[PDB]
Design a protein around this ligand. Structure first.
Ligand SMILES: COc1ccc(Nc2cc3c(-c4cnn(C)c4)cccc3cn2)c(OC)c1
Length: 264
């Protein structure tokens, strides 16, 4: 099968992912260049869902010129029935990659981390707080990590359980506030991803019961374990990201001036 976007024809190689009323396909243009096209079916979409997709497209377009750590959006077609977004095609998402890998290279972990900070910092500059960061929001595109979405609309999974979620990256202030959400909330989630890339587990994964897990995340008495590692700077980053008090938690601008990101 093939699809048309702004008078340009793309042939479908395969479906990469799905989630709700959206599908992502690996496609080729006439010159045999690879792209990823995101198709959103708007036929059963409520005003709230519509506005979320409009807001996600607007921010992707706006952020193109600000950072190359944001996934490229080349073109799009939006009607009342559907949305087509032509984007750069990545090799794999970070969650699928972390599930495969037995061990991560220290240099690779540092380079990916730098990319994540730059991408998240860019959205923060524009007043966006993602609030739902997790490895699946990151795409590996020829050695560099790029942010795929802004947490504004529907997330997707590779191609399966539509019920699947994770509270493993959720910050304490988001749970306590039941507005406490700030850029600091994304620092905690990034901290959890880096903790996963360092210890091979998220800080609270060992807790089965979801209620108990949420209780441990907000409990000041539940001490997060930071076992000794050769990179002392990395250990400091982790501890600074995973402070329960968001006022005491490190900021992204400070994380970008950290020895861990700036020094070999
Ligand atoms: C698990 O296997 C794969 C994961 C990702 C890719 N690339 C890819 C995924 C994209 C997703 C998306 C879809 N699902 N997720 C989690 C992100 C959205 C938007 C653009 C994308 C561009 N490129 C892939 O391409 C061969 C294979």
């Amino acid at each position: 099968q093939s699809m048309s976007v702004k008078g340009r024809i793309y042939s479908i190689l395969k479906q990469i992912g799905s989630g709700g009323s959206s599908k992502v396909f690996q496609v080729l243009n006439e010159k045999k260049q690879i792209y990823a096209i995101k198709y959103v079916n708007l036929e059963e979409a409520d005003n709230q869902t519509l506005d979320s997709y409009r807001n996600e497209i607007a921010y992707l377009n706006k952020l193109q010129q600000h950072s190359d750590k944001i996934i490229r959006l080349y073109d799009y077609e939006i009607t009342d029935q559907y949305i087509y977004m032509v984007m750069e095609c990545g090799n794999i998402d970070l969650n699928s990659w972390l599930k495969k890998k037995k061990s991560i290279d220290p240099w690779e972990r540092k380079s990916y981390w730098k990319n994540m900070l730059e991408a998240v910092h860019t959205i923060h500059q524009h007043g966006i707080v993602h609030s739902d960061l997790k490895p699946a929001n990151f795409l590996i595109v020829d050695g560099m990590l790029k942010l795929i979405d802004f947490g504004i609309a529907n997330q997707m999974q590779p191609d399966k359980d539509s019920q699947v979620g994770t509270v493993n990256y959720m910050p304490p202030e988001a749970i306590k506030d039941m507005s406490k959400i700030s850029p600091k909330s994304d620092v905690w989630s990034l901290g959890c991803i880096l903790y996963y890339m360092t210890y091979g587990k998220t800080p609270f994964q060992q807790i089965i019961n979801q209620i108990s897990k949420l209780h441990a995340i907000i409990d000041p008495n539940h001490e997060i374990e930071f076992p000794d590692i050769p990179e002392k700077d990395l250990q400091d980053v982790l501890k600074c990201c995973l402070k329960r008090d968001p006022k005491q938690r490190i900021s992204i601008p400070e994380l970008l001036a950290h020895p861990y990101v700036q020094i070999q």
